[PDB]
Amino acid sequence: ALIERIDAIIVDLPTIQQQTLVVLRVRCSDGVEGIGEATTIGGLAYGYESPEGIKANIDAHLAPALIGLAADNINAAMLKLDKLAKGNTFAKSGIESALLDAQGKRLGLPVSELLGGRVRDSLEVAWTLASGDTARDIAEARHMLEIRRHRVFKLKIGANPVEQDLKHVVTIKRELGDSASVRVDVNQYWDESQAIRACQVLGDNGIDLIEQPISRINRGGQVRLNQRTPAPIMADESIESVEDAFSLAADGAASIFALKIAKNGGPRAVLRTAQIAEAAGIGLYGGTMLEGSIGTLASAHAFLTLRQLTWGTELFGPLLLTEEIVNEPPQYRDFQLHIPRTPGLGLTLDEQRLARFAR
Amino acid sequence: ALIERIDAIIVDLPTIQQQTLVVLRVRCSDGVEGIGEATTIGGLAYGYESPEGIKANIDAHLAPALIGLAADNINAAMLKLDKLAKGNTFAKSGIESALLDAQGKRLGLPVSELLGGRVRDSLEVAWTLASGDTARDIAEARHMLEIRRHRVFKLKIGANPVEQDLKHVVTIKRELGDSASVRVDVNQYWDESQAIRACQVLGDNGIDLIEQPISRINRGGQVRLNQRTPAPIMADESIESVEDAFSLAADGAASIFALKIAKNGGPRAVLRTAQIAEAAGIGLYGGTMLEGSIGTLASAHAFLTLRQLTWGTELFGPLLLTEEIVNEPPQYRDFQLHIPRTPGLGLTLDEQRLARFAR
Amino acid sequence: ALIERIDAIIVDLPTIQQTLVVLRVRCSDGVEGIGEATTIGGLAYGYESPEGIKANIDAHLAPALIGLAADNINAAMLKLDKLAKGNTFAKSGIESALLDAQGKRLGLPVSELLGGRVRDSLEVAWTLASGDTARDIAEARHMLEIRRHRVFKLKIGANPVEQDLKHVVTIKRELGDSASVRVDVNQYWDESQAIRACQVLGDNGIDLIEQPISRINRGGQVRLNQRTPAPIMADESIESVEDAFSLAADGAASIFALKIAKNGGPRAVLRTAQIAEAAGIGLYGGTMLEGSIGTLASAHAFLTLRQLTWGTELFGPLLLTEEIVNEPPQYRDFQLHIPRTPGLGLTLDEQRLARFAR
Amino acid sequence: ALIERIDAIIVDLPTIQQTLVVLRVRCSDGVEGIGEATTIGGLAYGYESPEGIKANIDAHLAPALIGLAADNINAAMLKLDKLAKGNTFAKSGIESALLDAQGKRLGLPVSELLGGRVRDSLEVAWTLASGDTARDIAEARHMLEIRRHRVFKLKIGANPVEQDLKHVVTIKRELGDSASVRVDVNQYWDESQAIRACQVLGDNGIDLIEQPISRINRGGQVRLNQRTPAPIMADESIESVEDAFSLAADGAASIFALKIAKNGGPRAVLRTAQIAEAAGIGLYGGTMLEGSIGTLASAHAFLTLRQLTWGTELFGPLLLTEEIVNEPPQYRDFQLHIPRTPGLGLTLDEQRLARFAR
C-alpha cells in the first residue's frame, strides 16, 4: 500500500464560541483511508502553529514528501518529515494519527495494539471548571460528581491578581473537600517571584498539583519550585519536543509531565516522552489541546499502553463540542473515557457535518 | 548637532535635612540643551560616587571626551565613556539622561519614544514610612491611603536589633492588613546567620518581599535565601552594573531586581538590565536613589517601555523635596506617577532656584 | 501615523532560486516601510516556511496591528508577543518594516533609531560552495584577488567525516595566512564525531567551528566549549533571546551568531547581542541568506555593536541575480558599506517586484 | 491467540562451544514463536547463566504468561516486570519469541511491528581474537579481502597495559586507512590506567574505546568522556533502560552499545536507543554473541533506528560451526542482510536442535 493522497481541512465547530480543528484524510492505494487531527487553542497563543499555517505547511511541504511512500512504514514516513521539517509537531501529530488509523483498519487492529497493546480499556477524565464564578464552579463540580462524570477538577488561573486567583481556588477546594481532587493550571502566567508564595498557599490548602506555574524560559526557577513547592509541579509548556522532556528530567525540573501528542509529534512520539519519564521516575498525566474525538482517541490509544498515569488524563475535548465531524460519540461513563478495541481509531467521518463546517 | 558644552552643578535642596544633586546641562550646537541628574544618598555611604567626585570626574575626564562629538549619536558617546572610564555609573547616568533629553527636544518626541515606545502612561509609586515610630507610621500609611497617594509601603530596617526591627514591621503589617502591601529594605545590614530567622518571620507575617537582606559580598547566601525565604528576595546593591545583573540571574541569586539608572549607567543601560531580567524570568521593580524630577522622570521614561513591573516602582523622590530646580511639578495622583508625552523629559529649569541652591 | 495596511508578498528570485517574503507596511501619513522574512529551503532551517509566514501574517499578525500607532514599535511588538508565540521570522519582517517607516518619517537611518552607529561598514565572509576542493581554492583566491572577501566559510557534515575534514584542511593549507577559514556543521555531527573532528580542525588553523552538534545536546556543547582547541559558535542553538541567555548561563559557546530572523527583528537581535556582551561572549553577524532588505535591517543593527570579533556573513544579495530593490548593496574592500540615508535607505523596484511575485 | 506453552531449551553449539537458551512459545492459534537468551561464559558477563535463565523461565516467568493474549506483548512484558526484577536476558528471549509469533500471525517482519525499517542491512564489525599481532593483521587483511568486514574490534585489558597498547597500535599502524580499529576493555582498567591508555590510543587513530573502566566508577567515566581524545562507549555500564537514562543525564559516554539481552528485548533496546537519541548520544548495535535467532531479533530492532554512527558487531552466527536454524544469515559486502519475511524469518532445524540440546 502506498500513500496516494493527503487532505488538510480546517473546520470551525460550535462549543457549549468555536473550536477550530485541522482534519487530515490520508488515502492509501488499497482503498483504506486514515483520519487524523491537528488542533490548537486560539490561533497562535498556545503554540507557533495555527490552523492556517498547519494547512499551509501540510499542503506545500509535508504531504508532497510522503506521496508515493509505503503507507505501512510509519517509522520511515515520520523520520522523513523530521529530516525535512524542524518542529511542526502539531502537523506531524495529525499525519501520524492518520497513518496509524489507516494501518489499524488495514490489519483489523486497534491503534493501541499497533502501539504495543493496552493495559486498560478506560481512562480517568478530569474536568475544567471554567465559569470564573466561584459559586457556579462549586455547583458544577457537585453536579458532575452526582452524575458520576468527573471527580477531578482543574482551574485555570494566572490572569487575575494572585490573591484573587488564590481566594477562588482555595474556596472551591474547601467546599468540595475530600470528595474531589482539585488541581490548577497557570499556563506560564506567573513569574517566580509570584509563584513562591502562591505555590505555598495552594500546596497548604489541599491543591494536588500545580501545572506550569512559570514560564518555560525560566529553567532554574522550575528546578527550585520543584524542590520547594508543597504541591508537585507538572511541566506542560516546557515540553515542546521529546528532547525537551529529556532535558527537563535530567535537570529535575518537574516531578510530573503532561503528555500531549500535539506538542510531541503524534501518538508514537508521546510514547517516547512517556518512556523518558518512566526511565527517570517522573509521574505522568494525559494532556489535551482540546481536540475532538479523532485527536482525543489518538491520544487515548497511546495512553492505554502506559503502565501508570498517576494523575489521570484531561481528555474532555469532545464534551465541549456541540457538533462533531465524526459519527461515533465517545463513551464517558463513571468518571472515565472508554475505548473500543475496534480497527484503527474506530471512527468514521460524518461527511455531511464535515462539508457543513469546513471553511 | 555637536556637543558644545557640559556643566555639572552641585545643588543642595531642602527636604521635608537636605538632598544633594548633581545637575547636568549639555548645550548642543543647534541651540538645544539637555538636562540630567546624577544623585546619590549621603555622600559615599550608598556608592563610590559622591557629588564632589562626580563633579570632579565630569569636569576633568568625562566632559572633555565628548565635546565636539555628535549630540544625536548617544550610543557612540556612551560607548566612548565606557572605554575611557571604568564604573562611574552615576556620572554616566546624568550624561545619558541629558543627551536623551536633548535628542527628544530636538525631534519633538518624549524620551520613552526614543527608548522604543511606552506601554503605559503612569506608574505605581510606593512610599517609605520613615518616622521610626510604629504608631506614626501606621497613622501615615492610613492617611496616604485615604488621599489615594500610596498603597504600597516600604520600611527600611537593619540598624536596630533584629527583634526590634521585626516587631516594628510585623505590627505595621498586622494593623494595615490587606489594605496595603508592606515591603522591607535591609540594605545589606544583616549577615546570613541573622537573615535566616528574620526572613522566616517576615515571610510568615505578610511581608511581600525582602529587599537586599544581606551583603553583596555573600553571593552564596543570596542563592540560599532565594531558595528558602518564604517572601521573595530582591537584589539592589548586588547590582552595580549590567554585568552584575547577568551574573546574579545566572546564579539564581534573586527573583526580583530593583532597577536603578544610577547603578547601571543611565536610562538605556537600565533597559539592558531589565532585558537580562526579562530573558531569565526575573521580576522587576523601578528603583530610585531619591533623585528630583529630572532623574525621576529619566527613570520613568525607561520604565514605561517595560512589559511588566510586577512590584511597581518607588519613584517618590520629588515628594521629599520642599524646593526643586525644575518648573513643572510631577503628577502624583491615584497611587501613581503620570508621565507626559511632551518633548524630551518634558522639564524646564527654574534658573532662579538653581542659582539660589547651587553651591 | 497609524498602521493602515500590511502586505506580505512571496517572491522567488534567481540565484547565481531563493524565496523571500516581502512586507509592505503603509501608514496613515503616507510613509511606507518595507521588510523581509526569509528562510532557507522550506522548513529545513526553521519552523517557518514562506507559505506559513504569509498565512500567519495575513490571518493573525497583521490584523492585530491595523490602527495602532506606527511610531510606537515597542508597543506594537509587545502586542505580537502576546498574541503569538515564536514566529520570529514573521515578527522580524514586521519590525524591520516599522523601523524603516519610522526612519523615513523622522529622516533618520535605522541605525540611529537603534541608538547610533559606531562604524560605517561591516566585514563580510563568503561561503565556498562548489563542494570541490580545487574549485573552492580557486574561488577563494579570486575573491581575495578582487578584494571582496578574505574570510571563507565551508558548510560540512553531510559527508563522511574524514572526507569533510580532508576537504577543509586542504583549503586552509593552500590559503594559509592569506585568509581566515571557518566551518559550519549545522548540527550534523553527534558529540562522538565532533570530539576528534574539532581536535583535527583546531590543530589545522581553522578559526572557529559553528554549531558542530545539535541544539538538543546541551551538555555536549558545554563539553565541546571546554575541550575544542578552536572556539565553538552557537547558531541553531539560538531560537529566541531567552535561549541566548540560557546558553550564556551554561557556558555552552564562546561566540553567538546573531540573526534577526531567529530572534525576531533588529531590536530583538540587540537584546541577544547585549546579553552576550554582559557575559563576555564573542559576536558574529549572521544571515538567513536574505536579499538587500533583510541584509540591510541586520546591518543597521550590527553597526551599533561595540565589537563583532568574528565579523559578518552578510553576502546574501550577492547570491541573487536580480533584486526587487532599487539600490544595490555597496560591497567593496572586504566589506558591506551602509549609507546614512533615512530608514533602510532602500526603495522597492515595483516593476521587478511584480515580475517575481507569486 | 493465547500463549499455550513455553519451552526453554539449553543447547551447546561448537564454535570455530557456545551455550544458548532457545525459547519456543506455542500459541493457541498454531503459531510458534522462537527466541534466544544467550550470555558469554557462565556468570562472568552478566548476572544470568544459562542454568539460571532456564530455572527462572520454567519456575516463574513462563507460568505467569500461560493463558494470556499472545498478541498483547506490552501487557505480557509489563506483567514480567511486575513479577520479576532484572532478569533482562530471560525477558529478552521471551519478548523476541512473542514478536516472532506476532510477525508470523500478521505476516509481517518484526522490524515492521516495531515501526518500520529505514534500511535493509547493517554494517558488521569483526573481533580479531588470535591474540597474536601478525596473525590478527593477517586475519583482518583477509576479511577486508573477501569484503566481509572493514571494522575490527580488539579485546584488551587482561595483559600489562604497555603490551596491549603496543598490540593495538601496531595493528592500526599496519592497516591504516583501509580499516576502522577499535578496542573493548570490558571494565578491565582502573581510571589511573585509562588516563594514559586512552591518550595513547586516541593519538594513534583508534576510533573508539569501549568500556575502559568499571561501571562502578561513574565519576571516572564522566572524566574520561571529557578528556579521552577518542570517544568513550558505554557497554557494561548499561544493565537496564534506566541506567541508559542515568548515564545520559550524567554525560558519562558519547556512544551507547545497544544489546537486547542487557535491556530486556528488541522493544526495551529501542527505549534505550531513543533516550540516547533525545540526548545526542551515538549508537552502536552490540551483541552477546548469539546465534541467528538472537542476532536477527537485535537486527530487526536496529533497522528502525534513524542512525547507527558506529555500526554493529552482529557477527555472532559466524563464530558457530552449526546452527539450529534452517536459514543461514546473509553476510555480504561488509554487512548482514535482513529479509522482509514474516517474524524473524527463521525456522527451527528440529534435527539439529535435538542433537545439541542438553
Cα torsion D96, D98, D102, D103 to 10°: value is 20
Supply the CATH number for residue C64's domain.
3.30.390.10
Chain B nearest-CA distance from C50, in A, is 28
SS3 category, A44? coil
DSSP character for A214? B
B32 is in which domain, residue-wise?
A: 1-108+345-358
**B181 and B154 in contact (C-beta within 8 Å)?**
no
Between CA A289 and CA C120 the distance in angstroms is 50
Contact C112 B276 (CB under 8 A): no
Handedness of CA A115, A118, A121, A123 (dihedral sign): negative
Phi, psi of A210 (to 5 degrees): -120, 115
Contact D281 C190 (CB under 8 A): yes
**Residues B260 and B325 both lie in one domain:** yes
Between CA B122 and CA D223 the distance in angstroms is 56
Between CA B213 and CA B253 the distance in angstroms is 12
Between CA C196 and CA A184 the distance in angstroms is 49
**Residues A309 and A350 both lie in one domain:** no
Across D252-313, where does the E strand assignment appear? 255-258, 282-285
Chain B nearest-CA distance from C95, in A, is 12
On the CB side of B1, CA atoms within 13 Å amount to 21
Contact C60 A43 (CB under 8 A): yes
Burial of residue B98 (number of CB atoms within 10 Å: 0-12, 13-18, 19+): buried
Query: Inter-axis angle of helices B242-251 and B267-280, to 10 degrees?
Result: 10
Between CA C31 and CA C1 the distance in angstroms is 8
For C56, the closest of A44, A61, A220 (CB atoms) is A44
Best A193, A214, A217 member to test B by mutation, with max B CBs in 10 Å, is A193
Nearest Cα neighbor of C65 from C104, C105, C23 is: C23
SS3 category, C356? helix
> Do the bridges between strand B336-338 and strand C3-13 make them parallel or antiparallel, or are there none, so unpaired?
unpaired
**Residues A152 and A296 both lie in one domain:** yes
**Residues B2 and B135 both lie in one domain:** no
Cell of D298: 537485535
One-letter amino acid of D291: G
Contacts C–D by Cβ distance under 8 A: 48
Q: How many CB atoms lie within 10 A of CB D26?
A: 17
Nearest Cα neighbor of A21 from A301, A326, A239, A310 is: A326
Query: Inter-axis angle of helices C218-227 and C241-250, to 10 degrees?
Result: 50
**Residues C100 and C200 both lie in one domain:** no
DSSP for C104-145, written as a single string: HHHT-BHHHHTT--S-SEEEB-EE--SS-HHHHHHHHHHHHH
Nearest Cα neighbor of B342 from B112, B100, B56, B75 is: B112
**C257 and C287 in contact (C-beta within 8 Å)?**
no
SS3 category, D160? coil
Query: Please, which residues have CB within 8 angstroms of residue D194's CB and are 6 or more apart in sequence?
Result: D185, D212, D213, D220, D224, D228
Contact A246 D275 (CB under 8 A): yes
Chain D nearest-CA distance from A277, in A, is 10
Across B132-289, where does the E strand assignment appear? 152-156, 181-185, 210-211, 233-235, 256-259, 283-286
**B96 and B269 in contact (C-beta within 8 Å)?**
yes
Query: Please, which residues have CB within 8 angstroms of residue A145's CB and are 6 or more apart in sequence?
Result: A151, A179, A180
For residue D357, the cross-strand partners are D11
Out of D79, D155, D191, D327, the active site residue is D155
Q: How many domains are there within chain D?
A: 2
Q: Is A156 a catalytic residue?
A: yes
Query: Please, which residues have CB within 8 angstroms of residue C197's CB and are 6 or more apart in sequence?
Result: C161, C164, C165, C189, C212
Between CA B75 and CA C115 the distance in angstroms is 5
Between CA D115 and CA B214 the distance in angstroms is 58
Q: How many CB atoms lie within 10 A of CB C322?
A: 13
One-letter amino acid of A268: R
Region of D247 on the Ramachandran plot (φ > 0 left; ψ -120 to 50 alpha; else beta): alpha
Nearest Cα neighbor of A325 from A19, A112, A17, A32 is: A19
Cell of C228: 575544542
Cell of C263: 530572534
Contact A272 D267 (CB under 8 A): no
For A61, the closest of C42, C86, C242 (CB atoms) is C42
Nearest Cα neighbor of A46 from C216, C60, C242, C8 is: C60
Q: Which residue has the cell 551568531?
A: C257
Phi, psi of D260 (to 5 degrees): -55, -40
Between CA D181 and CA B306 the distance in angstroms is 59
Question: What b/e sequence results for C246-267 when a residue is b if at least 16 CB atoms lie within 10 Å of its CB, and e otherwise?
Answer: bbbbbebbbbbbbbbbbbbbbb
**A196 and A247 in contact (C-beta within 8 Å)?**
no
DSSP for B101-156, written as a single string: HHHHHHHT-BHHHHTT--S-SEEEB-EE--SS-HHHHHHHHHHHHHTTS-SEEEEE
One-letter amino acid of D207: D
Between CA B265 and CA B88 the distance in angstroms is 8
Burial of residue D30 (number of CB atoms within 10 Å: 0-12, 13-18, 19+): exposed
**D324 and D292 in contact (C-beta within 8 Å)?**
no
**Residues C20 and C79 both lie in one domain:** yes
Q: Which residues of A touch D76 (CB under 8 A)?
A: 117
Between CA D133 and CA A256 the distance in angstroms is 55
Cell of D48: 544470568
Q: Which residue has the cell 576542493?
A: C133
Contact C193 D309 (CB under 8 A): yes
> Do the bridges between strand B181-185 and strand C32-38 make them parallel or antiparallel, or are there none, so unpaired?
unpaired
Resolution (A): 2.1
Between CA A88 and CA A262 the distance in angstroms is 9
Q: Which residues of C touch A58 (CB under 8 A)?
A: none
**Residues C17 and C94 both lie in one domain:** yes
Q: How far is CA B247 from CA B163, B227, B280, C241, in A?
A: 33, 17, 11, 17
> Do the bridges between strand C18-27 and strand C3-13 make them parallel or antiparallel, or are there none, so unpaired?
antiparallel
D83 Cα distance to chain centroid: 25
Give all strands of the β-sheet with C255-258 in edge-to-edge order: C126-127, C151-155, C180-184, C209-210, C232-234, C255-258, C282-285
DSSP character for D335? E
Chains with 3 or more CB pairs under 8 A to chain B:
A, C
Nearest Cα neighbor of C299 from C72, C119, C70, C45 is: C119
Q: Which residues of C touch B79 (CB under 8 A)?
A: 118, 306
Nearest Cα neighbor of A123 from A282, A280, A259, A324 is: A259
Check chain C for breaks (C–N over 2.5 Å) and list the residue before each, or none: 16
Between CA B1 and CA D15 the distance in angstroms is 92
Cell of B281: 524570568
Between CA C151 and CA C319 the distance in angstroms is 16
**Residues A102 and A123 both lie in one domain:** no
> Do the bridges between strand D180-184 and strand D209-210 make them parallel or antiparallel, or are there none, so unpaired?
parallel
Chain A nearest-CA distance from B259, in A, is 15
Helix, strand, coil share (%) of chain B residues, nearest 5 = 45, 20, 35
Q: Is C322 a catalytic residue?
A: no
Q: Which residue has the cell 580557486?
A: C138
Query: Please, which residues have CB within 8 angstroms of residue A107's CB and are 6 or more apart in sequence?
Result: A114, A343, D106
Q: Which residues of A touch C85 (CB under 8 A)?
A: 44-48
Query: Please, which residues have CB within 8 angstroms of residue B138's CB and are 6 or more apart in sequence?
Result: B171, B172, B175, B176
Between CA B66 and CA B80 the distance in angstroms is 8
Between CA C298 and CA B340 the distance in angstroms is 33
Phi, psi of A184 (to 5 degrees): -125, 150
Handedness of CA B59, B64, B68, B71 (dihedral sign): negative
Q: How far is CA B328 from CA B31, B291, B304, B318, in A?
A: 21, 15, 19, 11
**A99 and A74 in contact (C-beta within 8 Å)?**
yes
Burial of residue A215 (number of CB atoms within 10 Å: 0-12, 13-18, 19+): buried
Cell of C127: 561561503
**Residues D348 and D300 both lie in one domain:** no
DSSP character for A232? P
Query: Please, which residues have CB within 8 angstroms of residue D215's CB and are 6 or more apart in sequence?
Result: D187, D221, D236, D237, D239
Chains with 3 or more CB pairs under 8 A to chain C:
A, B, D
Chain C nearest-CA distance from A49, in A, is 9
One-letter amino acid of C226: Q
Question: What b/e sequence results for A303-322 when a residue is b if at least 16 CB atoms lie within 10 Å of its CB, and e otherwise?
Answer: bbbbeebebbbbbbbbbebe
Across chain D, where does the E strand assignment appear? 3-13, 18-27, 32-38, 121-123, 126-127, 151-155, 180-184, 209-210, 232-234, 255-258, 282-285, 330-332, 335-337
Cell of A128: 475544567
DSSP for C134-195, written as a single string: HHHHHHHHHHHHTTS-SEEEEE-SSS-HHHHHHHHHHHHHHHGGGSEEEEE-TT-S-HHHHH
For residue B184, the cross-strand partners are B155, B210
Between CA C73 and CA A343 the distance in angstroms is 54
Query: Inter-axis angle of helices A242-251 and A219-228, to 10 degrees?
Result: 50
Supply the CATH number for residue D266's domain.
3.20.20.120
In whole angstroms, how large is the CA radius of gyration of chain A?
A: 20
> Do the bridges between strand B336-338 and strand B331-333 make them parallel or antiparallel, or are there none, so unpaired?
antiparallel
- The contact set of C with B (CB < 8 A) is 69, 71-76, 78, 106, 112, 114-118, 241-242, 244-245, 248-249, 267, 271, 274-275, 278-279, 304, 306
**Residues C40 and C27 both lie in one domain:** yes
Chain A nearest-CA distance from C113, in A, is 29
DSSP for B314-325, written as a single string: ---HHHHBSS-S
Question: What b/e sequence results for C207-233 when a residue is b if at least 16 CB atoms lie within 10 Å of its CB, and e otherwise?
Answer: bbbbbbbbbbbbbbbbbbbebbebbbb
SS3 category, C76? helix
For residue D153, the cross-strand partners are D127, D182
Between CA C100 and CA C109 the distance in angstroms is 8
For C74, the closest of B119, B242, B280 (CB atoms) is B119
Q: Which residues of B touch A227 (CB under 8 A)?
A: 227
One-letter amino acid of A113: E
- The contact set of A with B (CB < 8 A) is 163, 191-194, 196-197, 200, 214-215, 217-218, 220-221, 224, 227-228
End-to-end CA separation in angstroms for chain A: 31
**Residues C99 and C113 both lie in one domain:** no
- The contact set of B with A (CB < 8 A) is 178, 203, 209, 226-228, 230-232, 252, 255-256, 279-283, 308, 310-311
D178 Cα distance to chain centroid: 25
Give all strands of the β-sheet with C330-332 in edge-to-edge order: C121-123, C335-337, C330-332
**Residues C70 and C180 both lie in one domain:** no
Cell of D203: 593519538
Check chain B for breaks (C–N over 2.5 Å) and list the residue before each, or none: 16
Phi, psi of C110 (to 5 degrees): -55, -40
